Each structure stands twice: as C-alpha cells, then as structure tokens.
C-alpha cells in the first residue's frame, strides 16, 4: 500500500529541523520556468490529488512503518513522528494543505504560476515542501501533453496547407509508447496526456486512468485499429510474406488494418506484393477500411518518400484541390519508427516539397512521445516564495549568481489577465492591489478534500489549438 | 485493480487472428541488440515484473468481461479473444501457461545476447507469448538504469583509483536525486532499485520498499541518505540571513554528515566568506565521520566544481596525497548535484584530475540524468519471435529489414553459453542441443503461473560487481 510518509525525497525528512524557529507558514509555487515550447498545457495534477493526497493518508501503521524505515535509511532517528501524529490526531489523517491551480487543459506561457501550495495549520509549516516531490511529478503529464500538442500544431499546419482542411487531424499521431516507457503507471499517465490532443492510442492503460480520474461523455477517450506486428508476418516463414499479408487483410476485410511491411524488403513489399500480387485485395476495400502500409526501418523521411513514390505508380493517384498528390482512399501509410517532434517536422516538410498531401500519412510515436522527455524540457520547478516566521511574512527566493535563469519568484503569487488578454503572474502579493482583476487560480485541494475538478472533455476543450478554435 | 488483459499494446488484441493457422507454439526472446558505447548490460528487473504482474490467478470472469467491454469501444469492433482467455481461466484457474527462462539477475552480458526467452506451454495459448511482450519489454528500464549507473561507477572507480590509489567510498559517490524528475511513483521505485544494484546512496525512498518486497537484503535496508538542506530551508531565513541558515543547520546536524546547498545567491561568496571565514570555526571542529558537504547547484558544472575547490583549497588546510593529488580536510567535502549525467560526470572527474584534485573530494548527485533521460533504444532492448511450430513442424523465424541490418533478429530456439575463453555466446537454431558449449545459462524463472527461481538483492549485487572491484 502507498504510504505518503515514504513518498518524498529522503532529505526532506530532515527539513522540519532546518526552517527558522517559529515558522508558521511555508508557501510554495510551481512553474515551467522561462529561458521552442513557449507555452505549456497544464495537465495531471487532478490525478495526483485524487490518487495520493486526498482523504485519510496518515495512519498509526504508516507512521510506524516510516519511523522504522528512516531509522535504518539514515542510521539515525531524525523522523518527525510527532508532526505526523499531530495530523493523524487533529485532522483524522487529512492533510492541512491548500492548493490553488490553473484549470487543467489551460495553455499558459512559460514563467507563469501554475499552482501554489501552503499549509493551513501553523504546526504543519513543514508539510508544504514535504509534498514537493509528489506534486513535481506533474512535470511529466504537463510535458507529454505540451509536446504532444506541439506536434499537433505541426501536423495541422501541413495538413491545412496540403489539403485545405483539418479532417482527421486528431488521428494523425498514434501513441505506440506502451513498451517504451519506464512503468505501467507511467504508461497510463503519459497515454492520458497524449489523449488531451489526439484520439489514437495503443497504450490501453490510459483509458482506465481517464475514466477513473477525469471522465468523458464518450465511452472511451481513445481508439485503435487492427494492426500486424513483425511476429504475425515472420511466423509464416520468410518465403510466405505474401501469404501472411493476404490472410491478415482478409481477416480484417471491412475495418482499417495496418500491416508492417518491412520484415524483409519494404520496397519489394510495396511494389510487388501489395502493388501487384495482392493489389486486387486492396483496390476492393472500403474508404472506411483502408489498408495502412507501415514501413518501420531506414531513414524515416527517405523511406516515407520512396514508399509513397512506389505506391503512386502502382495505384491510381489523384491531385487534390491544393495541387497535392493523394493516394486512393482505400490506401494509406503510417510511419511508426524514429518519430519524435523533430523528425515529424522533417517528414511532413519533405512530403510537402515532393507534393504529397499530409492526408496520405499518419504517425506512430512511442519512446519519442512518452519517454524521451525530462523535467528540464520546460524547466518544471517548485520553489518556496513566502514564509511567515514570528508572525511576520517574508518574500523569499533564490537567485544564483552564475545562472539568472534559475531565479525564482518572490512572495505571494497570483495569475491575471492583462489588458491585452494575456497572462501575467503578479509577485509580492501585488494581486491584492486589485489593479489586474481577479486571481485566475482556483482552490483545487483543501484540508484533505478535492475542491475543484475537470472532466477530460473540458480539458480537451481548454487545450484546443488556435487554428482549431 | 490491475488487469493483465488490459496491459498490452492494443494491436496485440487482434494478433490471434493473424498468426498462421495450426500454430501450436510461439517462442520469443529478449536481447539488447548490438548496434554497428555500453558494450555490456546488467540484467535486472524481471523478477519484479513476474511477481507483481504475471504470477498466480491473473485471469477472472470479471477481468475478461471488463476487457471485452473496453475493447468493444476502443476498437469500435468486437475483435477480442474471449474464448482464449476463458480457456486459461477454466483449465489453469487463471494462471498463465507460459514458460520464461532467463539469465540470472545481476549478470553482466555483452550486447547481442539472449537475456530471456518466452514460450507457451499449452498449444491453445500460442497467442499468449507475444500478448505479454509489452509488459516484459518494460524490463528495458531497470536494465538500462542499472547498466548506465554501473558505467558511471566504472568512471568513478577509474578516476578514484588513479587519484587516490584505492576505491574506498566508491559505492557512495553517485547519489540518486531522481524522485521528482521521474514520470511516476512506480517508475521512481523501479529506477531507484536499479541504481542500488551499483551504489548505496539514494533519496528516492520508493526503491527501498520495492527491494524489500520483491528481492530482499541481509541488511535492514539496501540504500541510505544523509541530512541535507534544500534551497527553501536556506532562503526561508531571508536574503540577508544565509549565514544564520548555514549556522542553524550545521549545528542541528553537528554529529552526522550534512549537505548544505550553497548557491542560493552567490556560491563563490558562500564558500570563500561564509563557510571560509564567518563559519569556518564550525567546520574545522567537525568529525571525519560527520563532514560538511558543500553543494553547488548552478553554473557550468565543471567550471563551478573547479572554482569551488580552488576557493576552499585556499581557505582550508589542503594536503597532497600519496598519488600527488590535492585533498581537502576530512571534515569538508563537495557534492555536485546539478546537470550530472554520464557525460558530464566524465568531464568533471577528468577536469579535476587535470587540475590535480583527488576524486576523494567529490561526490555526485544525479536525478533526471540517472533515472529519466534514458530510452529503450539506448541499449536497443528488443523482444522478437524466433521460433514457431506450425502443423507439427518447427520453423526458425526472424526479421531482416533490407535498409537496416542492425534490426535483423535471431533465428530459432536460443541458448546462452560460456565460450572457451570465458566470454558469452548465443547459439541459434537450437544448436545448444548439440552440447558443444556446456550448460545453457538461461534458467526457468516462471512456469505456468509460478515463479520458479528467485534471486536476493545481495546475489544480484554480487553478480553486477565491476572487474576492478573483483581485482
């Protein structure tokens, strides 16, 4: 069972002894610090609040467990047993913490306050930063959602330019990341974050998380389609690749089906097997049930371009209203190898230069979508900005001489709309001067209760692209 | 509750309809594929997965119906092998009819070798071997963390040996700071445990419980920490009271090691004037078992470490050790815990050696670099089908993409052996059966729902030792 007393960085166990004597309040905030990625999608805090922070999170057993572990871990007795007991006895184990946050799905420029944390009981001054570690992990869903959305911007731009519209945009980036992430829990969180922007996923874990923690009007937030993997082709034997293809497309004759075509020779598969031997099984398919040819090796751009050129000569290609080449509607391509935001950009621009519509293509991304991301990408950071000691409030901050980029904000913070309709973060409690209207943060957690929440539908609406709006 | 029927890549739900008819066996294997450096990998983490997710009654009526309901909406189609899953439930009381054989955990194996294999034990369950690919492949993560951590240990060992003449304290020189920088609580536990294969310092507490539950140590705990400040415990005193914060903290922790972050405003002022003059009397009186550990946390990591040492070396009594390298007094040490990964670690210790500073003086903290900035393609961790039986005939299968020879996979039934020179070789096409290469190093670790062989965390550590530690 999860124990919040054991879910922090070890050194934080010793911090209650380090703050100034008679400190009654510790107030801290999270931002994606300013230094590509000029704006971030706020997503994921609600999951953390519900799964880990709400309700009775302290018991006698959990306190004893943490005491016993930390005694051995530090080779010394430094654990604040009394402080945790206070929370157990006074609040029935509910955390005396208040969290204010921007609404989930909101798209906010870097360097703005996204959420704040403060203790609601003076005895629990130490609790604010105890939970830094668990709250800071919000960096991951924020970062997946943001990087996913930046890829949606690229796709929308090139789809609009080559086809004249955005039809199918939300199906153009398919999460293949389940095997390439670091755990089952990460799989669910990361997939859910991708689904803020798109509707295609093979990472099943994301569905249950969304259903449990957020909710959608639709039965599921994300979809997949039948597809082969290398084993369902190669198992037929090296001389029987054609037999494999035929069986598979016949088994899935009236739904879309993706068939990995590079087990031995992608160019042969496209030109000779699909393009000649099995062509009669492709040209007979429904617009609602295309074959999706899937290359999976080689230089992604060169391979996509060559596959398209091959198919373009074996199948009837049309020219859309924008002047770009379009495969017949029973035939599409998916590139699911080596795709990240950079190579995605390179492929669509390369297609555009060769006059191929982005209609023709979809992308699968795994490690690039859900794993190859760190807290440094958006400088996701949690810092103390305000304390009260001896009944006096002090605005606090860091400002390292050798890195002004690491300077933190001072005092009590609030988020506001500017006269031009942008966001601004006011420091030093200046939000109280009421020169900038109401604070846009909302209380989302207070004294063990989740006080405000968002459906996955409203998160999606908040996260929409300008061009979509 | 966890449902194994919902723990695969979506497309795998459709694969039972795609294999050749009359297929009774699907046999697959995992390797860290060679790539035309990380030449050897630590095999670690499978036991966690076997116990947490694969063993026992993992199929129930309710889990089957749950999966059916989800996949109906997810695919907008009824494709789902309910009969296949029902069979496992009825015939095996929901235990997976799978055999997994694996190299012992902790083993250090060169790239391009079989590390584990997977096959179905019942012909009806040919589809199940690759169903569980997704969950098993996630073993890439503890493998890669353990491997990358160990490679950093090699660098530390080489430089510690060169600059000091021994390896004392080597296991305490890389401290896991990664808890907040990983993607989830579960990941934190797994990654932290992987680091602890090589080292003993961690703030990622989640790793301890995982190890205790799934592996076990003779010692009460596998990993340790020491009291340390963060910026909040310094800055809360106010900008003009950094010295008061330092004093309060070192006095609170006067008899144990304590790390104090010293760059809140001006790291160089802090070292030279605050530690080096104002509070010097509190530092020089400390025990060798309770040093002050000064922590810079910003600026160019190499440049800053060198300047911190230069400053401290002129405020404190420095000795020259038997190797000719400078050494701070035993009550004073430094930890660089910002921007550390395997590359910057190498650059720092090399820069230190150039400036004649012993590696004894320094320790490292690594967070994102240690537990998060790693992917499955770092070691090309990969799971492929190499053997099937169709119509009673075994056939050796593989992929071999024309444009990428590096993605070619192995053929047939596999086994891992010692070579005459003591190295490793993976035999293909069932050639291990010729018995020309002594015993298969793969052991059955899972069979029909039961974990059949387990390793303690102590055995794993012994297996993962550096050669230099052995010598």
Numbering used by the authors:
A (entry chain B): 8 to 42, 53 to 486
B (entry chain A): 8 to 43, 53 to 487
What's in the article?
NAMPT functions as a homo-dimeric enzyme that catalyzes the rate limiting step in the primary salvage pathway for NAD synthesis, the transfer of a phosphoribosyl residue from 5-phosphoribosyl-1-pyrophosphate (PRPP) to nicotinamide (NAM) to produce nicotinamide mononucleotide (NMN). These structures consistently display a NAMPT homo-dimer with two essentially identical active sites at the dimer interface. Typical NAMPT inhibitors were found to occupy the portion of active site responsible for NAM binding and a tunnel-shaped cavity extending from the NAM binding site.
Unlike the G217A/V mutations, the G217R mutation caused more drastic reduction in the inhibitory potency for all compounds on our test panel. G217R causes His191 side chain to rotate to the same extent as G217V, while introducing additional changes to the structure of the NAMPT inhibitor-binding site. The R217 side chain competes for space with the bound inhibitor (e.g., with the terminal phenyl-trifluoromethyl group of GNE-618) in a similar fashion as H191R. Besides introducing steric clashes, the R217 guanidinium group also creates a basic patch at the surrounding protein surface that favors polar groups over hydrophobic groups. We conclude that these additional structural changes render the G217R mutation more deleterious for NAMPT inhibitor binding across structural classes.
